[PDB]
């Protein structure tokens, strides 16, 4: 199966979780493509992919509710071609804030609205992949069960 992991990371934690997931999922025997959202072009982004994993860290203040580069992507979700594609979301954040990883539900909500099938429960964790290998690895496993 072909998996795209697109992520937005401003201090590298979500980017870190994305690296790990690719690792874990490629060890499942799959072809994975890692994509920085700062380098992504929404238009037809999902073409050729069996599933798409979206990573977006949380930023409560100035930043309209999401990470920079992901916000520009998200806003063009309906150009991505998610209809009938497997999708899941993950994020790094901090519990000490009122809204912990609020972009996870949003991504699931939108993708679902566009004909996409959520295959795994949203990953909400703190720190990098090494901070919570177990949470990371449950997300990957869930994913691998639908591929
Ligand atoms: C100014 C600021 C506001 C933040 N607001 C939130 C927020 O409201 N919700 C949340 O879950 N995390 C929030 N965070 C915590 C970051 O999301 C956390 O450090 C995360 O792991 C960084 O993700 P990234 O390195 O992948 O970009 C905030 C961080 C900063 C410094």
Swiss-Prot record:
Superkingdom of origin organism: Bacteria
Keyword Flavoprotein among record annotations: yes
Sorted UniProt keywords: Electron transport, Flavoprotein, FMN, Transport
UniProt cross-references to InterPro entries, sorted A to Z: Flav_short, Flavodoxin, Flavodoxin/NO_synth, Flavodoxin_CS, Flavoprotein-like_sf
Cofactor(s) in the UniProt record: FMN
SUPFAM superfamilies xref list: Flavoproteins (SSF52218)
Domain (Flavodoxin-like): residue spans on this chain: 3-144
GO molecular function: electron transfer activity; FMN binding
Protein's UniProt keywords contain Disulfide bond: no
Stated role: Low-potential electron donor to a number of redox enzymes.
Family: Belongs to the flavodoxin family.
The name this protein goes by in its record: Flavodoxin
Organism: Desulfovibrio desulfuricans
